[PDB]
Structure formats: structure tokens, C-alpha cells
Amino acid sequence: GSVQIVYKPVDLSKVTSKCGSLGNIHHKPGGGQVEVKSEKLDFKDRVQSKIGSLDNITHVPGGGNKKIETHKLTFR
Amino acid sequence: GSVQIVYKPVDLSKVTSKCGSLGNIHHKPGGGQVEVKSEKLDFKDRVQSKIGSLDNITHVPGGGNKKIETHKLTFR
Amino acid sequence: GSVQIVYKPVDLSKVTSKCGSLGNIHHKPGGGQVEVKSEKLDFKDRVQSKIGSLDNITHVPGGGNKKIETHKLTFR
Amino acid sequence: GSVQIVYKPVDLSKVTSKCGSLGNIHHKPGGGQVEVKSEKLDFKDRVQSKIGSLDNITHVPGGGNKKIETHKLTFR
Amino acid sequence: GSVQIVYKPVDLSKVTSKCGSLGNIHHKPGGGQVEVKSEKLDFKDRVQSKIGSLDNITHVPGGGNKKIETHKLTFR
Amino acid sequence: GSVQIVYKPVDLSKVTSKCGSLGNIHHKPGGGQVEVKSEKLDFKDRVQSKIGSLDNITHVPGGGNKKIETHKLTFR
């Protein structure tokens, strides 16, 4: 009459976040012809423009991970 | 009569955040023709512009990780 | 009659964070033709511009890691 | 009668490649959980055994072009 | 009666490559959890045994182009 | 009777490469958790054993091109 306890849990698990712009291909983006001719134009107020530009913009407030483990063994 | 306790939890696990612009291919981005001709233009107020530029912008407030483990053995 | 306690928790785990711009390939970025001709232009207020520029920008307020472990063997 | 053997292979072969790039290559193999139980392992000639082991190759030639060519002539 | 053998192979072949960029290559194999239980391991002749081991190759030649050629004349 | 063997192979063959950039190469293998139990290990001739070991190669030649060319001529 004897007690043998083996407490041997194995964790090979993954917790993962892939957040934003991942693993894309962009092949020859742009590549065209852009012509702008502008004459006698007038602006009374704030203005912003993009002519022929290429913009990639990524914001990631998210993608956080939380792991909690409890491994309690009680013998009496 | 005897007691044998083996406490051998094994952790090979991964907690991972991949947040932002990861693993992308950009091949010949831009590469085109941009022509801007502008004349007698007038601005009473703020202006900002991009002509033919290439911009990659990444903000990551996120992507944090938190791991907690508690490993308790009590014998009485 | 005897007590044997073996306490051998094994940690090979990873906590990892890859934040903003990792592992990208930019091949021949820019590479095109940009022409700007501007005449008799007038600005009353702030102006800023990018002509043909190439910009990579990365902000990471995030990407922190926190690991807590507790190991506790109590014998009585 | 006389024997005349003329062996004039002429070779102007081109074996070529152009690659603009070779990208983000990730090779991660993961082992599982492997358990072998026995009284005996008994290996007696020319045995190859792989228990939970990993053999891994990441081979990334920028060309990797092969020309292979065997010339054989026999006279008896 | 004479024997005349004229072995004149001619090779002008080109084996070539152009690569613009060999990029980010990551080789990160992870071993598992391996447990082998026995009374005996008994290995007797020409045995190869790999238990939980990793054999890893990362070969990244900028060309790696091969010309392999063989010439063999046999006369009896 | 006369024998006349002429062996005049001509090789002008080119084996070449251009690589613009060999980039970021990471080789980071991780061992597992390996547990081998017995009363006996008994290895008796031409045994290769690899328990939990890592063998690693990182070979990154700027060219790595090969020209292998065996010539043989046998007369009897």
C-alpha cells in the first residue's frame, strides 16, 4: 500500500496574433503615367493632395496576448 | 508503504505578437511617370502635398504580451 | 516507509513581440520619373511638400512583455 | 579493314535565370509529443531509427542552375 | 587495318544567374517533447539512432550554379 | 596494326553569377525536452547515436558555383 503521483502536463501550445499588414506582395505598384496641369486655381481654405504618390499606412492598437496558467497539486 | 510525488510540468509553448508591417515584398514600387505643371495658383491657407513620393508608415501602440504561471505543490 | 518529492518543472517556452517594421523587402523603391514645374505660385500660410521622396516611418509605443512565475513547494 | 571513329559533340547551350529577388523564406518545423514505452529496443544490423528527431534543410540558391553531362565512348 | 579514334568534344556552354536580392531567410526548427522508456537499448551493427536530436542546414549561395561533366574513353 | 587515339576535349564553358545583396540569414534551431530511461544502453559496433544533440551548418557563399569535370582514358 503506497502512493505514486506523477504530475507531468506537457504544453506545446501556441498563442499568436498576426495584426496589421503581414505577408503581402506588391509587384510594380504605381507604374503608370500621371499628368496634372492646373492653371488660375485659387484656395480660400486648408488643402491637401496626393499626385501619383504610393502610401502604405498601418495602425495596430490591438494584437495583445494574455496567457494565465495555474498548476496546483495538494496532498494530505 | 511510501509516497512518491513527481512534479514535472513541461512548457515548450509560445506566446507571440506580430504587430505592424511584417514580411511584405515591395518590388519596384513607384516606377511610373509623374508630371505636375501648375501656374498662377494661389493659397490663402495651409497646404500639404505629396508628388510621386513613396511612404511606408507604421504605428504600433499594441502587440503587448502578458504571461502568468503559478506552480504550487502542498504536502501535509 | 518514506516520502520522496521531485520538483522539476521545465520551461523552454518563449514570450516574444515583433512590433512595427520587420522582415520586409523593398526592391528598387522610387525608380520612376517625377517632374514638377511651378510658376507664379503664391502661399499666404504654411506649406510642406514631398517631391519624389522615399519615407519609411515606424512608431512603437507598444510591444512590451511581462512574465510572472511563482514556484512554491510547501511541506508539513 | 580499318576503323575510324570521330566523336565531335559541339555544345553552345545556355542555362540561365534572372530573379528580381528571392523573398522572405521561413522554415520552422515543430516536433510533437513522442512517447516510446518498452522492455527492450533491440536493433541487430543496418537499422536507421528516428524517434522525435528533426532533419532540416533550407537551401536558397540565387541561381541553382545545373548543367549535367556524361560523355562515354567504348571500343573493343 | 588501323584503328583511329578522334575524341574532340567542344563545349562553349554558359551556366549563369542574376539575382537582385536574396532576402530574409529564417530557419528556426523547434524540437518536441520526447520520452523513451525501456529496461534495455541494445544496438549491435551499423545502427544509426536519432532520439530528439536536430540536424540542420542553411545553405544560401549567391549563385550555386553547377556544371558537372564527365568524359570516359575505353579502348581494349 | 596501328592504333591512334586522339583525346582533345575543348572547354570554354562559363559558370558565373551576379548577386546584388545576400540579406539577413538567421539560423536559430531550438532543442526539445528529451528523456531516455533504461537499466542499460548497450552499443556494440558501427553505432551512431544522437540523443538530444544539435548539428548545425550556415553556409553562405557570395558565389558557391562549381565546375566538376572528370576526364578518363583507359587503353589495354
From Swiss-Prot, chains A, B, C, D, E, F:
Glycans are attached at K44, K50, K66. Tau/MAP repeats lie at residues 3-33, 34-65. It is found in: Cytoplasm, Cytosol; Cell membrane; Cytoplasm, Cytoskeleton; Cell projection, Axon. The record marks K8, K14, K18, K28, K37, K40, K67, K72 as: Not glycated. The modification N6-acetyllysine is found at K8, K14, K18, K28, K40, K44, K66. Phosphorylation at serine and threonine residues in S-P or T-P motifs by proline-directed protein kinases (PDPK1, CDK1, CDK5, GSK3, MAPK) (only 2-3 sites per protein in interphase, seven-fold increase in mitosis, and in the form associated with paired helical filaments (PHF-tau)), and at serine residues in K-X-G-S motifs by MAP/microtubule affinity-regulating kinase (MARK1, MARK2, MARK3 or MARK4), causing detachment from microtubules, and their disassembly. Phosphorylation decreases with age. The modification Phosphoserine is found at S2, S21, S49, S53. There is a cross-link at K8, K14, K18, K28, K40, K44, K50, K66, K72 (Glycyl lysine isopeptide (Lys-Gly) (interchain with G-Cter in ubiquitin)). Expressed in neurons. Isoform PNS-tau is expressed in the peripheral nervous system while the others are expressed in the central nervous system. It comes from the Eukaryota. Changing S2N: In FTD1; minimal parkinsonism; very early age of onset. Promotes microtubule assembly and stability, and might be involved in the establishment and maintenance of neuronal polarity. The C-terminus binds axonal microtubules while the N-terminus binds neural plasma membrane components, suggesting that tau functions as a linker protein between both. Axonal polarity is predetermined by TAU/MAPT localization (in the neuronal cell) in the domain of the cell body defined by the centrosome. The short isoforms allow plasticity of the cytoskeleton whereas the longer isoforms may preferentially play a role in its stabilization. The tau/MAP repeat binds to tubulin. Type I isoforms contain 3 repeats while type II isoforms contain 4 repeats. It is linked to In Alzheimer disease, the neuronal cytoskeleton in the brain is progressively disrupted and replaced by tangles of paired helical filaments (PHF) and straight filaments, mainly composed of hyperphosphorylated forms of TAU (PHF-TAU or AD P-TAU). O-GlcNAcylation is greatly reduced in Alzheimer disease brain cerebral cortex leading to an increase in TAU/MAPT phosphorylations. Frontotemporal dementia 1: A form of dementia characterized by pathologic finding of frontotemporal lobar degeneration, presenile dementia with behavioral changes, deterioration of cognitive capacities and loss of memory. In some cases, parkinsonian symptoms are prominent. Neuropathological changes include frontotemporal atrophy often associated with atrophy of the basal ganglia, substantia nigra, amygdala. In most cases, protein tau deposits are found in glial cells and/or neurons. This is Microtubule-associated protein tau. It comes from Homo sapiens. The gene is MAPT. The chain holds residues 621 to 696 of 758 of the full protein.
